[PDB]
Amino acid sequence: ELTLESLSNVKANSYSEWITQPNVSRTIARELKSFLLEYTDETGRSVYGARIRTLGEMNSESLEVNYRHLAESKAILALFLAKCPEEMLKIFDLVAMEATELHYPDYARIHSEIHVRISDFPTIYSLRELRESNLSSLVRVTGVVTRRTGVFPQLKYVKFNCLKCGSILGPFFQDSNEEIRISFCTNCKSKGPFRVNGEKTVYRNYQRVTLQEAPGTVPPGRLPRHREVILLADLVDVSKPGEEVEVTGIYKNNYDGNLNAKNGFPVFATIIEANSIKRREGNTANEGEEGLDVFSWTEEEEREFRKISRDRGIIDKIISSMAPSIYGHRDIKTAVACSLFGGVPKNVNGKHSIRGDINVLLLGDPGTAKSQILKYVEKTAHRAVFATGQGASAVGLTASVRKDPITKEWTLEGGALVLADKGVCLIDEFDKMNDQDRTSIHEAMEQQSISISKAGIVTTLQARCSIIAAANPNGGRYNSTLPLAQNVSLTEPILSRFDILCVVRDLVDEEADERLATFVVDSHVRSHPELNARQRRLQRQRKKEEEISPIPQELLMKYIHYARTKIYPKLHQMDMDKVSRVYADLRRESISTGSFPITVRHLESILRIAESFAKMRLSEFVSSYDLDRAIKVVVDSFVDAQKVSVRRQLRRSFAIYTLG
Amino acid sequence: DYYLFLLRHSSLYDSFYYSNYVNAKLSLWNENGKKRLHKMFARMGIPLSTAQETWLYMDHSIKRELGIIFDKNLDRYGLQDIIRDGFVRTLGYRGSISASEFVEALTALLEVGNNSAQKLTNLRKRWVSNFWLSWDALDDRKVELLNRGIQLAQDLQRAIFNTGVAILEKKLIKHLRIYRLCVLQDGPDLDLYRNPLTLLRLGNWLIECCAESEDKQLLPMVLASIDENTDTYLVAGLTPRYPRGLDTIHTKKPILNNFSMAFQQITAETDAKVRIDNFESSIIEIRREDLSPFLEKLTLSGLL
Numbered sequence: 001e002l003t004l005e006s007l008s009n010v011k012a013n014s015y016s017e018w019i020t021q022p023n024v025s026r027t028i029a030r031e032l033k034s035f036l037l038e039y040t041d042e043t044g045r046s047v048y049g050a051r052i053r054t055l056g057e058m059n060s061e062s063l064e065v066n067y068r069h070l071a072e073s074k075a076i077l078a079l080f081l082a083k084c085p086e087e088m089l090k091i092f093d094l095v096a097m098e099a100t101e102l103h104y105p106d107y108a109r110i111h112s113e114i115h116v117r118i119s120d121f122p123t124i125y126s127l128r129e130l131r132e133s134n135l136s137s138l139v140r141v142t143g144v145v146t147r148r149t150g151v152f153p154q155l156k157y158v159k160f161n162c163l164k165c166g167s168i169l170g171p172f173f174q175d176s177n178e179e180i181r182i183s184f185c186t187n188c189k190s191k192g193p194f195r196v197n198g199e200k201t202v203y204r205n206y207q208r209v210t211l212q213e214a215p216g217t218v219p220p221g222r223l224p225r226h227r228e229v230i231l232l233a234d235l236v237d238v239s240k241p242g243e244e245v246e247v248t249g250i251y252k253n254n255y256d257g258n259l260n261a262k263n264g265f266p267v268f269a270t271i272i273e274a275n276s277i278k279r280r281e282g283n284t285a286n287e288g289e290e291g292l293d294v295f296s297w298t299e300e301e302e303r304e305f306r307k308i309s310r311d312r313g314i315i316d317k318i319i320s321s322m323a324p325s326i327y328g329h330r331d332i333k334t335a336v337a338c339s340l341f342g343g344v345p346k347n348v349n350g351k352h353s354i355r356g357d358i359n360v361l362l363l364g365d366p367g368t369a370k371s372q373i374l375k376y377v378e379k380t381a382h383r384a385v386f387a388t389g390q391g392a393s394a395v396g397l398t399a400s401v402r403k404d405p406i407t408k409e410w411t412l413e414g415g416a417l418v419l420a421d422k423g424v425c426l427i428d429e430f431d432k433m434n435d436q437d438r439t440s441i442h443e444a445m446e447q448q449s450i451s452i453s454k455a456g457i458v459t460t461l462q463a464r465c466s467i468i469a470a471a472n473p474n475g476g477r478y479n480s481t482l483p484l485a486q487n488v489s490l491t492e493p494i495l496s497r498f499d500i501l502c503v504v505r506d507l508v509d510e511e512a513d514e515r516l517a518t519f520v521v522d523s524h525v526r527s528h529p530e531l532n533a534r535q536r537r538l539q540r541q542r543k544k545e546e547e548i549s550p551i552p553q554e555l556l557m558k559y560i561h562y563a564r565t566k567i568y569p570k571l572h573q574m575d576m577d578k579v580s581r582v583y584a585d586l587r588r589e590s591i592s593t594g595s596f597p598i599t600v601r602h603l604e605s606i607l608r609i610a611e612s613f614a615k616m617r618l619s620e621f622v623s624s625y626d627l628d629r630a631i632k633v634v635v636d637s638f639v640d641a642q643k644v645s646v647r648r649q650l651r652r653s654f655a656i657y658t659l660g
Numbered sequence: 661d662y663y664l665f666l667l668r669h670s671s672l673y674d675s676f677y678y679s680n681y682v683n684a685k686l687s688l689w690n691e692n693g694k695k696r697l698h699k700m701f702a703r704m705g706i707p708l709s710t711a712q713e714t715w716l717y718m719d720h721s722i723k724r725e726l727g728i729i730f731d732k733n734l735d736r737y738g739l740q741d742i743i744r745d746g747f748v749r750t751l752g753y754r755g756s757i758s759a760s761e762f763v764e765a766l767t768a769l770l771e772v773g774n775n776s777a778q779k780l781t782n783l784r785k786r787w788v789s790n791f792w793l794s795w796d797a798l799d800d801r802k803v804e805l806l807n808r809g810i811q812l813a814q815d816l817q818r819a820i821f822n823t824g825v826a827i828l829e830k831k832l833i834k835h836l837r838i839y840r841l842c843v844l845q846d847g848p849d850l851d852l853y854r855n856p857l858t859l860l861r862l863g864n865w866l867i868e869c870c871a872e873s874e875d876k877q878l879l880p881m882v883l884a885s886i887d888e889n890t891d892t893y894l895v896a897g898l899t900p901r902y903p904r905g906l907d908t909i910h911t912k913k914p915i916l917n918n919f920s921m922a923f924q925q926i927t928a929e930t931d932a933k934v935r936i937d938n939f940e941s942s943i944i945e946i947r948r949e950d951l952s953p954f955l956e957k958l959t960l961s962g963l964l
């Protein structure tokens with residue numbers, strides 16, 4: 001037997017042969033199993049044991065292992081994995097399955113093999129800087145998905161049969177990029193016809209994708225580069241055409257006759273076999289964080305969620321934690337939080353569908369941090385799409401029709417509203433936009449679907465998306481002596497579809513200006529860029545978050561994701577008379593004096609906001625406090641969009657409902 | 661056979677989900693119980709996709725070895741009491757039926773099938789009418805009615821579970837010194853609890869949930885349900901029950917029901933507008949106005 005000290009010295013003048021030796025491969029497996037079983041973090045809890053426990057619960061087929069953990073301890077194995085992926089991964093999958101069969105015996109009846117997904121590889125390359133020295137090694141490459149072939153079954157253990165000797169050949173592992181070539185018989189001793197051994201075989205899922213370089217990475221004015229990526233089983237359909245992705249994989253080469261024929265030199269083709277996939281569409285928090293999905297939670301994190309969810313005033317802290325560095329504008333923050341958490345969709349007897357998402361509009365003076373709030377919402381949301389003004393078209397926010405280059409049949413392609421299904425679409429400068437482009441979202445805002453009838457395609461899509469829009473008033477500035485209908489160009493059909501409207505006014509006030517200036521100067525002071533040091537960095541970065549954020553942002557992201565995924569509150573016991581009276585009063589005080597369209601569509605927004613406030617508390621039933629808070633929000637959103645003449649009377653008239 | 665709800669006419673996951681004993685032992689009404697059930701199914705070796713198939717079309721190999729899988733795994737989660745022996749009847753090329761499933765189908769047929777005095781009279785007439793529907797299902801010629809009863813039982817158990825989770829999450833059960841009160845005034849589908857059998861179903865769910873609770877007490881429970889059309893509460897008293905798997909040292913003549921004498925004592929002394937006319941003396945119909953005072957008197961009545 002060998003020791004971790006003995007793996008340092010190498011023989012055979014090649015690392016692959018050194019790894020594949022029988023004596024070395026027995027020490028490697030034992031060391032990998034010890035790493036899997038005995039690793040503990042700072043708090044003292046084994047992480048891979050918990051991951052294995054969750055694997056069986058979720059009926060998963062893959063295990064995620066961080067490269068930093070295996071590099072910090074047993075760094076020689078980390079170097080071996082870095083240089084020689086193919087041989088290390090076969091052993092590591094086997095040891096992973098052996099470790100898994102210590103928590104779930106008889107798990108082989110569910111899945112027969114456990115795959116390992118590597119995460120947080122240190123060195124990141126671009127497609128432009130790939131050379132021949134990276135051949136047969138693990139690489140990390142960012143790109144943009146362009147085209148996807150589709151899922152087909154592929155042979156796994158290939159068999160052959162020869163007729164004159166009737167010989168059956170042993171199973172062959174297919175390279176997945178090179179056809180199995182066999183010409184010699186162990187029995188026939190000569191060339192013979194070979195069959196595929198019809199039936200009695202094992203298949204795998206296979207797919208192929210093309211990655212172009214991201215426009216941000218490409219130097220301005222230069223042509224992009226592309227490469228081909230092969231996705232095997234458990235990795236199919238994860239990436240979608242149009243998204244931006246980061247892939248960790250193995251860089252390989254193969255001989256192509258056409259490439260040699262056209263160029264005129266013995267050049268080879270290259271392709272990447274994908275190992276790990278991470279989505280980066282809309283994510284600017286990629287500067288930090290560890291893992292393949294930063295919106296996923298562990299068991300202790302869920303327990304912490306349920307612990308902090310029962311504190312009184314959780315809603316106040318959640319609201320205060322929205323865009324902490326922006327000063328004031330608490331109504332905007334409340335509307336943003338309500339939109340982010342969202343309502344509950346409904347279907348009554350399978351024939352009547354009711355939408356459950358909140359849309360927000362921000363109409364305000366220039367220089368009031370609306371765009372920064374939109375950027376914060378983009379960063380925090382799980383799925384987010386951004387658009388602005390004249391840069392969007394009718395079919396750029398909807399589905400488009402294209403001729404498939406391969407199949408040559410008319411096909412549907414995605415858009416901004418489809419890329420943000422169960423997400424958020426943000427539209428900055430929503431008033432500086434063509435009417436034909438603006439009117440394309442009428443169906444998606446309410447019916448949450450898209451219908452296309454073009455070139456023989458008659459289909460209906462699904463876009464369960466929420467819209468937060470920012471606009472400027474006529475003349476660039478809001479006239480408080482005029483009603484709303486003469487401060488904007490939008491008509492009733494599009495104004496009715498919005499749930500919350502926030503009018504932002506800039507007024508002269510010495511104390512307010514002094515406080516805002518002090519806050520902004522302190523913020524600029526804070527953000528100036530000037531045990532293990534890598535954790536000293538974390539503690540210093542947490543100290544700065546302590547002042548202005550009641551809860552950390554990374555915790556809040558997982559909190560929002562868990563709340564949206566798991567909770568579905570109901571409305572069993574509530575006061576119908578109060579809501580009916582509020583709706584009737586709001587309808588009466590609109591035609592008499594007002595220019596804010598109120599229909600039945602605004603009655604349901606109160607219930608949606610109540611369900612959102614219930615979601616904020618991780619409660620399964622809506623209480624009276626949440627409904628009262630929703631009524632107060634709706635009433636304050638209507639009173640503050642009036643003329644200065646009647647605002648004082650309307651506020652007094654509507655004040656009886658919001659007694660608390 | 662097993663203490664599972666309609667095993668041979670539904671999936672395995674459904675049988676484990678809608679069982680009183682499993683729910684009591686694992687607390688499935690919240691997320692932790694569901695996660696524990698998923699972990700159990702993962703450990704046992706049955707894929708989650710296979711456990712959700714119909715019993716007839718379930719994999720033959722899994723069905724053959726179900727007994728060993730139960731025996732070797734059920735002990736870890738405290739569910740070793742679900743294994744028992746029963747009676748199964750088969751007639752030709754038709755299919756097997758157990759006694760438990762038959763009685764649940766009959767009870768489902770009893771429960772649902774087919775100026776306030778007339779309103780109560782029509783309800784009682786319909787309850788009388790359901791008797792012949794349950795009677796017809798005992799004849800071998802009428803099997804479609806038995807299948808209809810099975811479907812009705814599944815729907816009824818789903819509704820009972822849905823109401824019970826709402827009762828348990830909002831803490832509607834009030835712990836008084838002498839008894840525990842539960843009054844259902846608001847919510848959906850309160851028109852199913854106008855029948856005594858459905859209220860007994862919900863009470864059996866709640867008592868089963870309370871018996872396996874670590875809290876050691878034997879207080880009787882009171883369950884009240886409103887009917888808007890009649891403006892009357894239907895009120896039932898339920899006796900406590902020992903845990904199913906508990907030893908025989910406490911075994912005796914079971915806990916006695918003392919609600920009949922208390923109700924008669926309160927009714928005789930005061931001119932309350934109560935109706936004690938059912939065969940079961942523990943079920944009464946009290947007008948809406950009299951509920952809150954009457955219960956107060958019960959608090960001082962004693963014998964509970």
Ligand SMILES: Nc1ncnc2c1ncn2[C@@H]1O[C@H](COP(=O)(O)OP(=O)(O)OP(=O)(O)O)[C@@H](O)[C@H]1O
Nearest residue numbers: 325326327328365366367368369370371372470520
């Ligand atoms: N409390 C605050 N109110 C307004 N602006 C603030 C505040 N704190 C900081 N700022 C800064 O003021 C600047 C003005 O913000 P911003 O550019 O979003 O304004 P805007 O008029 O809403 O933008 P746009 O026309 O792009 O929608 C930003 O640099 C922002 O960071």
Ligand SMILES: [Zn+2]
Nearest residue numbers: 162185188192
């Ligand atoms: Zn041969």
